[PDB]
Chain A
Amino acid sequence: QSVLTQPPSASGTPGQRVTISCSGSSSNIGSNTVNWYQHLPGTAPKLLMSSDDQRPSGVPARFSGSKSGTSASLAISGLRSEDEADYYCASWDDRLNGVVFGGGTKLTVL
């Protein structure tokens, strides 16, 4: 099982904002950073947010993240059709001495 808890599904309307939460424990989220990934089946994943506040080189102004306590959230504004994909949250776990990944979510746009 994933040490980080994430809702299995999320949905949103075009043009508005949707937030996806990723909840963990004090040992991993409370002590380390979070990373976000996109995944399309048949291709390779990409980067969305690093170091919890730092935007990567390529992604356009849209994806936004924040961290609070033992939970983190990713905010997407100005949603468009191309945003349909799978989102993952990951972090380091000091107790396990390894990398632990979440279950992932599927976003649907009406």
Chain B
Amino acid sequence: VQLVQSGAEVKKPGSSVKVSCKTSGGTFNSFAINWVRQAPGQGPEWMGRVIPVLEIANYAQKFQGRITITADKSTSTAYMELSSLTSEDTAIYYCARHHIAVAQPYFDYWGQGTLVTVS
């Protein structure tokens, strides 16, 4: 299917931002949702993921409790919460889906991305 996310957001340092990524109906259960960001002049880096059917979450180590991922089954939408925003936090955020019956992850379908700038 397709994943549609919120538009570009502009926000001040020190606060928090919330980003959504709306998906289809059948893309839950045996399907995980992964988050990847790409800084300017830098390669992609992984933040975490969540499995809606088991409501279990994983987080990157170098995010020490700075990122929170949650979702609601009724509306079928996933939420992203990032706090303590700083100047270095400017990047482009993607949402991508994973198939759960595979040992090492391989991201198969990606969103078009949303741009967050800080000034």
Is there a contact between chains A and B in the complex with CB atoms less than 8 Å apart? yes
Interface set of A (CB-CB < 8 Å, partner B):
2, 32-33, 35, 43-45, 47, 50-51, 88, 90, 92, 96-99, 101-104
| Residues 79-119 of chain B, each 1 if its beta carbon lies under 8 Å from chain A, else 0 | 00000000000000000000000001111111111000000
Complex interface: chain A residues within 8 A of B26 (CB): none
- Give the CA-CA distance A96 to B104 in the complex, in Å: 14
A92 & B112 in contact (Cβ 8 Å cutoff): no
Complex interface: chain B residues within 8 A of A88 (CB): 43-44
Chain B interface residue count, CB cutoff 8 Å, equals 16
A2 & B104 in contact (Cβ 8 Å cutoff): no
**Min CB distance, A19 to chain B, in Å?**
20
Partner of A33, one of B104, B107, B108: B104
- Give the CA-CA distance A51 to B105 in the complex, in Å: 10
Partner of B112, one of A2, A43, A50: A43
B43 & A45 in contact (Cβ 8 Å cutoff): no
A47 & B108 in contact (Cβ 8 Å cutoff): yes
- Give the CA-CA distance A102 to B42 in the complex, in Å: 9
**A92 in contact with B61 given A44-B113, A45-B110, A103-B43 (CB within 8 Å):** no
Ordered by A's residue number, 30 sampled pairs between the chains whose C-beta atoms are within 8 Å are: A32-B104, A33-B104, A35-B106, A35-B107, A43-B112, A44-B109, A44-B110, A44-B111, A44-B112, A44-B113, A47-B106, A47-B108, A50-B106, A51-B106, A88-B43, A88-B44, A92-B105, A96-B61, A97-B61, A98-B46, A98-B60, A98-B61, A99-B46, A99-B105, A101-B43, A101-B44, A101-B45, A101-B46, A103-B43, A104-B43
**Min CB distance, A52 to chain B, in Å?**
10
**Min CB distance, B58 to chain A, in Å?**
9
- Give the CA-CA distance A88 to B43 in the complex, in Å: 9
Complex interface: chain B residues within 8 A of A43 (CB): 112
Complex interface: chain A residues within 8 A of B104 (CB): 32-33, 92
- Give the CA-CA distance A44 to B43 in the complex, in Å: 15
Most buried by A among B43, B60, B111: B43
B43 & A2 in contact (Cβ 8 Å cutoff): yes
Known: A43-B112, A98-B61. 19 other contacts (CB 8 A): A2-B43, A33-B104, A35-B106, A44-B109, A44-B110, A44-B111, A44-B112, A47-B106, A47-B108, A88-B43, A88-B44, A97-B61, A98-B46, A99-B46, A101-B43, A101-B45, A101-B46, A102-B43, A104-B43
